[PDB]
Amino acid sequence: KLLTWESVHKENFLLARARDKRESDSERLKRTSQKVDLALKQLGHIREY
Amino acid sequence: SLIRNLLDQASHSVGHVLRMLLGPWSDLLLWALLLNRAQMAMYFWEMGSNAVSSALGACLLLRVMARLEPDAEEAARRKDLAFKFEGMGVDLFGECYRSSEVRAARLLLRRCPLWGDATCLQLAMQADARAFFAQDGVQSLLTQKWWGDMASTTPIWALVLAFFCPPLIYTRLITFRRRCLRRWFHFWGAPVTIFMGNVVSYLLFLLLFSRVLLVDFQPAPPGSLELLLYFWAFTLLCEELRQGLSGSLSQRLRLYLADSWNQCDLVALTCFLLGVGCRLTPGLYHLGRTVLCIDFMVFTVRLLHIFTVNKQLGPKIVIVSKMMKDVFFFLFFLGVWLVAYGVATEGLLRPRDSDFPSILRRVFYRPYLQIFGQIPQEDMDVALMEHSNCSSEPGFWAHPPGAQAGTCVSQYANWLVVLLLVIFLLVANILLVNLLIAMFSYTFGKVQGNSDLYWKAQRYRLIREFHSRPALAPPFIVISHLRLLLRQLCRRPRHFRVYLSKEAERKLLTWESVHKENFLLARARDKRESDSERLKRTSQKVDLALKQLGHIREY
Amino acid sequence: IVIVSKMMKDVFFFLFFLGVWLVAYGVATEGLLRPRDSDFPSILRRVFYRPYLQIFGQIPQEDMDVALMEHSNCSSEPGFWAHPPGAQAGTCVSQYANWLVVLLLVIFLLVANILLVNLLIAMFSYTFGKVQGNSDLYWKAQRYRLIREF
Ligand SMILES: CC(C)CCC[C@@H](C)[C@H]1CC[C@H]2[C@@H]3CC=C4C[C@@H](O)CC[C@]4(C)[C@H]3CC[C@]12C
Ligand SMILES: CC(C)CCC[C@@H](C)[C@H]1CC[C@H]2[C@@H]3CC=C4C[C@@H](O)CC[C@]4(C)[C@H]3CC[C@]12C
Ligand SMILES: CC(C)CCC[C@@H](C)[C@H]1CC[C@H]2[C@@H]3CC=C4C[C@@H](O)CC[C@]4(C)[C@H]3CC[C@]12C
Ligand SMILES: CC(C)CCC[C@@H](C)[C@H]1CC[C@H]2[C@@H]3CC=C4C[C@@H](O)CC[C@]4(C)[C@H]3CC[C@]12C
Ligand SMILES: CC(C)CCC[C@@H](C)[C@H]1CC[C@H]2[C@@H]3CC=C4C[C@@H](O)CC[C@]4(C)[C@H]3CC[C@]12C
Ligand SMILES: CC(C)CCC[C@@H](C)[C@H]1CC[C@H]2[C@@H]3CC=C4C[C@@H](O)CC[C@]4(C)[C@H]3CC[C@]12C
């Protein structure tokens, strides 16, 4: 029972700090960076028009 | 949860609020508070009316319910919700005060029908909203009330000189807000005037008590001055008893048991009563004089607590209450080292005067005085005493010249005694005292900021107590006591509360609503212009652009 | 020099606190021991000046402690007196509760020489740290003023 309880709480803690890292400003900036470069590439695939 | 059980208990039966509630925006707000819906409560507060009073009542209810909470997590969430509520309330108060000083002032003493018809200040005090009391606007308002009808910007020396010279009331100086009688009553009923009268009466009491104690305290029956002092203390005890009963007879007694200087005042009066009893009974004259002498110290100490309302001393008077743990640590450490050195030297040198009081003196009192410059070097060092066979034990003794240093000390290891004195001087006069200085510095730096915040609320409390205090001085307060007894006796045959206009109520309601909506718009603009929110807005713009461009890839 | 002007509030607080405690202790000891020299200047001396000098190492231990004085019937009141050897300590002191007098001297030494002085040191340190930066800025303008006057 305590094994299951601590497993539940540890997975909650993993999810919590993962969400914190994702909502961190630097990680948001890098995600916007791989969005912008991907957009630039996908326009680069349609420049022939 | 903590809601259904309390509702069932109420059905089967702050307490008055529970009695009134049974299973427009105010109802939703209180429902969110009891259900602990943070966002719902905030929305109801920002959408409702009388926002300041509603927030203060919400903070009070959350504090009380968190104190009643059995579970730490719910208590913590409730108390942080109360903290944020107090923060938004004080921000609203500041933005309201920054526009209309007089309108903000008249908002306070408004009797809000919600929360049991309690004034906003009383709600903050019962909620211990020290952050709210620390606000500059409420500080200025309490200053004005303490200088009630007394031109709060007036200098202190002008006020005191007017106090000694009543005729100077009608002069170009000492401005204010039957004209003669109204001026007289307004000047003599001001809380600051009452404070000055009580201060001068208390200094007169200290002078009288000292004069009776030092000179006119013969075993002969008490004279005119001592009888006057007995009447004096009777008036003081009557005043204190009346104050305790005013500010449920047993319930109020338990409350008065707290506020520990009210406790010190009470113990002072009891010690004075024991002193008078011992003085009157023939046997206990000396004991009565001794206990009266201690009672003088207790009264003089209470003077310090009474005179704490000064704006430049009060924070430090609050500080010195926080130094007791530090001085207790120093006292314990010095006690241990003092036992060490005292017993060691009392063993190394063996005086023939082995009486118990003399031993308890030479072990504790003398080494204690070694700290403050009283070093009996000629009493404890072998070179400074003349050698003589003052004892029959086979050794060298060198009887010292001290009166209480022993008639015949030993000298076998007096070099070790000298070295031990050197070590004691190093430990006590150098290590311990300087360490205590350092830890005073650290604790002072830690606690001064919180002490100022506490002193704001304590000053508000003292202003309230002096406002409730009757006008007449302790020499003449017996007249006020008889007046009060008449008011209770004349009933048998039969706090600020400034009035506001009915239309002015709606006017101030609209004003505070406009200011609160402006404040909400301001904070919304601030959070929108915040960098993180700008970043999330750019993120949603960019991934929306990616999504919309994903719909034209088929081209 | 600009700083030392800002220490006046702190030293005034210390002076007031020491005044209160000094009044309490001085009157208490002046009542506990009853010198026959009850002249007003002598009382104002033994209550204020002597306890003040107890702070700076001048402790009239042989003047206030019963064990250090010789016992004598220097008064007709029914008690034990032990006339002290001091010049201004009273011609005939009393000794009924001189153990309490000694304990009260110990408490006074603990309060004044330890608590008050070290607290004053601490608050000087805090105020100095707070005000030195502003004092330098003020001293710039004050120096300009002095240069202009000279
Ligand atoms: C604030 C308090 C503690 C100050 C204490 C000072 C006290 C000790 C002073 C103030 C008034 C003084 C009295 C005034 C006048 C006389 C005249 C004469 O009879 C000698 C002593 C006697 C009777 C003084 C006794 C000492 C006295 C009571
Ligand atoms: C001389 C004997 C009576 C020892 C006690 C004297 C002093 C230290 C006592 C008497 C009144 C007491 C104060 C009573 C009330 C308060 C308010 C509280 O919020 C902080 C402590 C504080 C400020 C106490 C501090 C200690 C105090 C000042
Ligand atoms: C740290 C604490 C526990 C130390 C205890 C105090 C000790 C060191 C000292 C202080 C007073 C001293 C006592 C003084 C007087 C007497 C009476 C004598 O006929 C026997 C020794 C005896 C009984 C002493 C015993 C030791 C004593 C109690
Ligand atoms: C506060 C702590 C660290 C200091 C130690 C307390 C000392 C000073 C106390 C505890 C017992 C007290 C003693 C009690 C009894 C006597 C006998 C008397 O004839 C002279 C004073 C004298 C000797 C007292 C002096 C003060 C005393 C020694
Ligand atoms: C024995 C008596 C007369 C000693 C008098 C010492 C007084 C007058 C001295 C000591 C510190 C000095 C102060 C030093 C610093 C300042 C700050 C400056 O902006 C105005 C002058 C002022 C306030 C000085 C005034 C004079 C001063 C207060
Ligand atoms: C600054 C505060 C805290 C300290 C108290 C002030 C004291 C030291 C002052 C106030 C009255 C003054 C006394 C005035 C009169 C006399 C009588 C004279 O024959 C000896 C000095 C003596 C006894 C003075 C000593 C100093 C004194 C006692």
Residue numbers in the entry:
A (entry chain B): 1120 to 1168
B (entry chain A): 471 to 483, 503 to 512, 558 to 711, 766 to 835, 851 to 1097, 1108 to 1168
C (entry chain C): 920 to 1069
Paper passage:
Transient receptor potential (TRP) melastatin 4 (TRPM4) protein is a calcium-activated monovalent cation channel associated with various genetic and cardiovascular disorders. Genetic defects in TRPM4 are found in patients with inherited cardiac conduction disorders. We determine three cryo-EM structures of full-length human TRPM4 embedded in native lipid nanodiscs without inhibitor, bound to NBA, and an anthranilic acid derivative, IBA. We determined cryo-EM structures of full-length human TRPM4 in endogenous lipid nanodiscs in apo (HsTRPM4apo), IBA (HsTRPM4IBA), and NBA (HsTRPM4NBA) bound states at overall resolutions of 3.7, 3.6, and 4.5 Å respectively.
